[PDB]
Amino acid sequence: MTMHKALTIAGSDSSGGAGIQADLKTFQELGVYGMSAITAIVAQNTLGHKGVYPLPLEAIEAQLDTVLEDIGVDALKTGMLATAEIIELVAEKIKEYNVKNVVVDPVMSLLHEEAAEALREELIPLATVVTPNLPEAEVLSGMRIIKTVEDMKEAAKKIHEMGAKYVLVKGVDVLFDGEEFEIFETFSAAITAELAKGYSLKEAVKTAKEFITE
Structure with a gap:
């Protein structure tokens, strides 16, 4: 739908319920081109593995510089x-x-x-x-x-x-x-997408609330 672009800087969720994966889905649904910078693998903490694996700083910088130098963003969200x-x-x-x-x-x-x-x-x-x-x-x-x-x-x-x-x-x-x-009376990703399209924060929050309830 739109030519606007949003970036999520957050954790990766292999189940797709949250994380950059859910952020990117939200961006797409609201007609913004989505890009992601993964800061960590986020899983459950168990007997077999930790719940958070931070990525190397150089790998995060590579992702951020790629998006910000070469593509450009109209808004961004941060998560984990x-x-x-x-x-x-x-x-x-x-x-x-x-x-x-x-x-x-x-x-x-x-x-x-x-x-x-x-x-x-x-x-x-x-x-x-x-x-x-x-x-x-x-x-x-x-x-x-x-x-x-x-x-x-x-x-x-x-x-x-x-x-x-x-x-x-x-x-x-x-x-x-x-x-x-x-x-x-994700949510944050929806706010980001509305800001990317040019909307005021207050209008973005109201529109993001309605999107979540639908």
């Missing part, structure tokens, strides 16, 4: 980023290529804690929107527990002050734009 080092690389590339439409889906030890810090300090300040669920919002905002809508608004406030232009806390859902709160 795995390590602080990968997060920092991704933030660097967003700045290097001046990518203005960025959807951060915060899919989430000294490893995990350093990774959370890199997300808060390096990537969140570049986000058009951050879409945490409640545990993710607690980690990102530092809220002890998010138990009420007022708590959700506070966490959205906090994340906006960390640099995110919009924040959508998934509960009701709470959208905050730094001045007003909007309270509503």
